[PDB]
Amino acid sequence: YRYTGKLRPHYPLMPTRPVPSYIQRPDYADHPLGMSESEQALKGTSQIKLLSSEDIEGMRLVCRLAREVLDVAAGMIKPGVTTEEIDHAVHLACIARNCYPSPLNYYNFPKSCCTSVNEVICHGIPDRRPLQEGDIVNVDITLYRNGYHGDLNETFFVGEVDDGARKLVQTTYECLMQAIDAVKPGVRYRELGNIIQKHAQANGFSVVRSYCGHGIHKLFHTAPNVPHYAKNKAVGVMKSGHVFTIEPMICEGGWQDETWPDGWTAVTRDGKRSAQFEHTLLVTDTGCEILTRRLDSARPHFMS
Ligand SMILES: Cc1nc(-c2ccccn2)nc(N[C@H](Cc2ccccc2)C(N)=O)c1Cl
Ligand SMILES: [Co+2]
Ligand SMILES: [Co+2]
Numbered sequence: 001y002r003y004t005g006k007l008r009p010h011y012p013l014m015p016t017r018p019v020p021s022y023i024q025r026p027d028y029a030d031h032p033l034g035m036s037e038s039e040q041a042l043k044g045t046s047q048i049k050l051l052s053s054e055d056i057e058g059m060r061l062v063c064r065l066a067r068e069v070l071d072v073a074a075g076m077i078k079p080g081v082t083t084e085e086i087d088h089a090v091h092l093a094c095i096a097r098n099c100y101p102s103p104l105n106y107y108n109f110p111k112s113c114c115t116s117v118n119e120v121i122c123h124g125i126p127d128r129r130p131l132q133e134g135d136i137v138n139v140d141i142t143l144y145r146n147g148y149h150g151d152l153n154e155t156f157f158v159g160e161v162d163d164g165a166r167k168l169v170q171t172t173y174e175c176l177m178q179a180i181d182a183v184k185p186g187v188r189y190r191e192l193g194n195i196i197q198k199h200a201q202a203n204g205f206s207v208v209r210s211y212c213g214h215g216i217h218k219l220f221h222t223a224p225n226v227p228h229y230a231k232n233k234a235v236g237v238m239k240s241g242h243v244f245t246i247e248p249m250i251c252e253g254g255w256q257d258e259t260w261p262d263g264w265t266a267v268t269r270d271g272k273r274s275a276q277f278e279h280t281l282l283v284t285d286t287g288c289e290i291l292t293r294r295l296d297s298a299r300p301h302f303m304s
């Protein structure tokens with residue numbers, strides 16, 4: 001395998017981290033290949049769940065807890081800290097909140113969160129690599145509590161970063177927020193990609209095509225599929241009670257991705273940097289509720 005940039009995996013990985021048995025587990029947690037039978041039963045269906053009041057309360061809770069866990073990771077971002085060390089702290093923070101870390105054993109994914117440095121678009125596997133001054137790193141968190149999953153991510157700066165990194169991260173965040181601002185009942189899911197690509201393109205960046213936002217509730221990933229690029233064929237119209245993510249991945253160079261031999265790490269084919277931000281959203285009569293928002297601070301971590 002020819003690596004596309006400077007990043008390499010840093011092995012060995014620590015043995016899988018156990019989750020105490022008192023924490024409620026999703027179906028895939030104990031499947032030998034980490035398959036989710038509840039999800040697979042709906043594979044190829046485009047119908048979107050309308051959440052009940054109980055569902056909404058469940059989503060508010062797990063999304064708030066997921067935010068707390070992302071904030072834990074954010075506080076650890078500094079030169080010399082390994083992504084494995086971030087993952088260990090995330091794992092413990094989930095357990096402390098009586099939550100299962102959703103990525104863990106999801107289709108045999110080996111860790112409790114995804115850490116995506118520089119040219120890694122998404123699904124980076126926490127490993128022994130110390131973060132370096134100038135790096136950008138995304139941490140993508142998902143928690144499972146009482147049958148519900150809550151999902152968010154932010155890109156962080158490691159020490160002082162260059163102008164390109166600042167512009168990339170800022171633009172990606174703006175892309176997410178412009179998309180969120182358009183969410184309300186009656187809007188087609190396919191419209192969000194038009195909004196995101198317009199803003200990315202205006203700043204000389206490209207939009208990843210192979211990975212999309214998704215419905216999330218009792219399932220980790222389900223209908224609708226939410227592409228982030230323009231003129232896509234996403235099926236569905238937003239209705240009050242829909243819960244889904246928007247999670248644009250934006251690139252300095254071209255949009256093309258490839259996967260490392262580990263089967264997970266998605267990287268830019270040109271080795272240039274990529275950034276991502278993500279919220280879980282509930283559609284309401286007036287627009288949407290950002291379930292994974294900060295409650296105590298106005299801005300994402302890269303601005304604070
Ligand atoms: C956004 C997303 N992420 C994952 C993933 C898997 C492991 C850890 C973190 N995230 N999986 C997703 N979908 C998978 C399929 C998949 C797997 C790997 C990359 C893309 C899609 C599914 N529905 O079973 C999807 Cl749609
Ligand atoms: Co994912
Ligand atoms: Co996520």
Ligand SMILES: [Co+2]
Pocket residue numbers: 151213214245247278
């Ligand atoms: Co997501």
Ligand SMILES: [K+]
Pocket residue numbers: 116117118119120121122136137138273274275276
């Ligand atoms: K990245």
